[PDB]
Design a protein around this nucleic acid. Sequence first.
DNA 1: CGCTAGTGATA
DNA 2: CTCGTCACTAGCG
Length: 348
Amino acid sequence: GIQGLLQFIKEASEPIHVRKYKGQVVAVDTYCWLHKGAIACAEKLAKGEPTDRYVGFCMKFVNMLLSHGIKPILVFDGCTLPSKKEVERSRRERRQANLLKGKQLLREGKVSEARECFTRSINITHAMAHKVIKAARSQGVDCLVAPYEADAQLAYLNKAGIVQAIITEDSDLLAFGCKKVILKMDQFGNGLEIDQARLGMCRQLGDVFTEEKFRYMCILSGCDYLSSLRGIGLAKACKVLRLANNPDIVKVIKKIGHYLKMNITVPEDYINGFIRANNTFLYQLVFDPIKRKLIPLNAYEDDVDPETLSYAGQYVDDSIALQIALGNKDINTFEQIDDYNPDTALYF
DNA sequence: CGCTAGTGATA
DNA sequence: CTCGTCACTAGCG
Ligand code: NA
């Protein structure tokens, strides 16, 4: 996502412990636990050999949060946004390559390299995530499969007061407008918290501590929805945002070469791609657990047409979205793989 | 000299 | 059949 974002605003970071959120609700970007837990049993998944260590891993963290008296809500990624299809396919091809080479080209002789390639060809499937969901629900923990990206869903849960903090390793959460994000948490509950209001503690940031300006900085720096101009990182983006007074971001991006004293010819596609990136950060589709329907991250403004925001995810029926959120309906085939019912046991 | 972006080691 | 990350630094303006 946003490279070097954590180091850039480390002044706003506060080392905490999970006790600080006792008797409160916290949402967890489960994919990080799933991935770090799958790294341990990489060769097992590479060979196609049955294993469930990652389940015990995720449940270890969950049991920690529970032991400190916190109500955790596990969140998973759902469908992939159209602005990421070819990227996910690229990573798919990379995993296929690392698996093929790591297997056939390293089946005899070299072993360490074969494992080093197998750990790269590791793919987190929704079946594994479903195992985690079954275990978590067996331990009475609520789960939610996002309609699309997990970071938007989490940001919604946080901005709606449903949760008070978000445990993740992704730095993009801040660009979605989260209030409290707990990064780099270990087994015991030791992690780095970053509050939105505390963004002002960064002198280097200047007057770019407001949600909108901070978002513009994150996008200009280089995000998953849009690569940055060559030579533009966090410092340069922050600088050009600090210097410019004009509220209209388009003219600013057009004069990015003027404000930074460096020869930059802004591509025709970059402005539209910027608007699309910002619109994706603002209006990506999430699932409202209370109303049990599919809503945008933020309510649409007066200058935006919903029919042109297909890249921020497309709507489906609320019953289908509900079945997806419960992990009952498969992401790809849309087939019913489970029959969990929250009525006959959140979502109330 | 500040800052971007790529590499190598690593689980 | 869902996303890496960090320390170090070459090399840019
Ligand atoms: Na960049």
